[PDB]
Write a protein that binds this ligand. Structure first.
Ligand SMILES: [Mg+2]
Length: 448
């Protein structure tokens, strides 16, 4: 077999059997062999084991003659930003993201923060690590501490016109991850009144692991919004490359609708731009992009696909329904900070509440959200669905899984390549009843 910690887009594993200091050091040696010339940026999240894993990575890199730029405790997006800004050969973020206490991981990038993924160097690194029985060498290169965040903060602030911002009251919930540090550094330069929830970085996670998708964690943000009369609420995962929105009623906003909303915000700044989107849920995004004067560009779902498509198209923005938002000016990388700044500016400038903005689109394009189905046989399950609907002659698209467009409703079905699991998304043209009946019908077919 192979080292299980090496996944499609990153390294994720239980410490210490799937990921540990020796493996981290070997990853550093292997990465040094995979990159073009130059220094390597390292950062880490709040997990208790992250600093030691970073130090082991640093040791391997420096034994291989790589200068290391240690940006310290940070969010994943800061490694992306600094790798590109400092014209480094590459970068690694040590993070467990939203995973349990006994897990950690790494996200690896090369020049311009371009992703290193399974088929673009990550499995090459795996195989090198797997065969590496050499004793650790000693450092032949330096480590420099560079914790200044000024360039990163200035970049974030460049997305909004501060003179147009209103003193919105915003709940912010770092979930005891790292987001609060950035909020606090931005705050003196913004007019917002922040209501801080679970704010202090704490890798023991007294309030639960940082994952706003869990209803219990969701409710802490919702309650704070409602109890404080906030304009809206924002929560992040631990490494803050995903953000999650709550309107003034406390309602958690489905991520699909943020793609169209952020496209509107960006296209006001970059008229006529292209916007890349994924194939799961599409109709609202296409309409909002076109009405804002942009050009929507369909792309397969997945980190590397979206970024590569954006690069090839000079797209200003790319978004997935699953809370990943990518920005051309940000080295084509994802940020959990840029999106809420843009939304706060949109609310400030338009006089419309986030709730009103979202509700209107929800009524036009109701969606199921992504529903997962563990199945005995993915191929047989997809076949039951296709067979059932064949007589209706839907328009089919195989860009990513199977999309079927029936006119007034559509679905996308994607199959996992790591386990037998199907993922379903359904939307309709303004018809909640049709949404429910078709969703339940497909659910029955997938299960039976
Ligand atoms: Mg994350």
């Amino acid at each position: 077999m192979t080292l299980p910690a090496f996944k499609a887009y990153d390294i994720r594993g239980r410490v210490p059997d799937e990921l540990n200091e020796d493996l981290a050091r070997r990853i550093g040696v292997a990465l040094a062999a995979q990159l073009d010339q130059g220094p390597v940026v390292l950062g880490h999240d709040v997990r208790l084991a992250s600093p030691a894993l970073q130090e082991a990575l640093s040791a391997g890199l420096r034994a291989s003659g790589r200068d290391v730029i240690d940006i310290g405790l940070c969010g994943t997006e800061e490694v992306y930003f600094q790798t590109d800004y400092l014209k480094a050969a590459g970068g690694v973020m040590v993070t467990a993201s939203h995973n349990p206490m006994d897990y950690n991981g790494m996200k690896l990038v090369r020049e311009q923060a371009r992703p290193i993924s399974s088929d673009t160097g990550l499995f090459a690194i795996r195989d090198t690590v797997a065969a590496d029985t050499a004793a650790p060498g000693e450092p032949t290169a330096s480590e420099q501490s560079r914790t200044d965040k000024t360039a990163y903060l200035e970049h974030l602030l460049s997305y909004v016109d501060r003179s147009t911002l209103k003193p919105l009251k915003l709940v912010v919930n770092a979930g005891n991850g790292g987001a609060g540090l950035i909020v606090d550094l931005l705050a003196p330069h913004l007019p917002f009144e922040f209501v801080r929830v679970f704010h202090e970085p704490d890798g023991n996670f007294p309030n639960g692991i940082p994952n706003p998708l869990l209803p219990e964690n969701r409710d802490a943000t919702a309650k704070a919004v409602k109890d404080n009369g906030a304009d809206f609420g924002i929560a992040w995962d631990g490494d803050f490359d995903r953000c999650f929105f709550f309107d003034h009623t406390g309602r958690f906003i489905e991520g699909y609708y943020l793609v169209g909303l952020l496209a509107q915000a960006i296209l006001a700044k970059q008229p006529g731009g292209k916007v890349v989107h994924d194939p799961r849920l599409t109709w609202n995004t296409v309409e909002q992009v076109e009405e804002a004067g942009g050009i929507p560009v369909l792309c397969k779902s997945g980190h590397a696909f979206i970024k590569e498509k954006m690069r090839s198209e000079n797209a200003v923005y790319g978004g997935e329904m699953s809370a990943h938002h990518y920005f051309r000016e940000f080295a084509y990388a994802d940020s959990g900070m840029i999106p809420w700044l843009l939304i706060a500016e949109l609310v400030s400038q338009s006089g419309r509440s986030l709730a009103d903005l979202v509700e209107a689109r929800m009524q036009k394009f109701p969606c199921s959200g992504e529903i997962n189905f563990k199945v005995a046989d993915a191929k047989a399950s997809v076949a039951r669905v296709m067979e059932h609907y064949a007589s209706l002659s839907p328009e089919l698209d195989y860009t990513d899984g199977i999309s079927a467009d029936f006119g007034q409703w559509r679905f996308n079905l994607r199959s996992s390549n790591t386990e037998p699991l199907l993922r379903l998304n359904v939307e309709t043209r303004g018809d909640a009843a049709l949404l429910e009946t078709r969703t339940q019908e497909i659910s029955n077919l997938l299960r039976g």
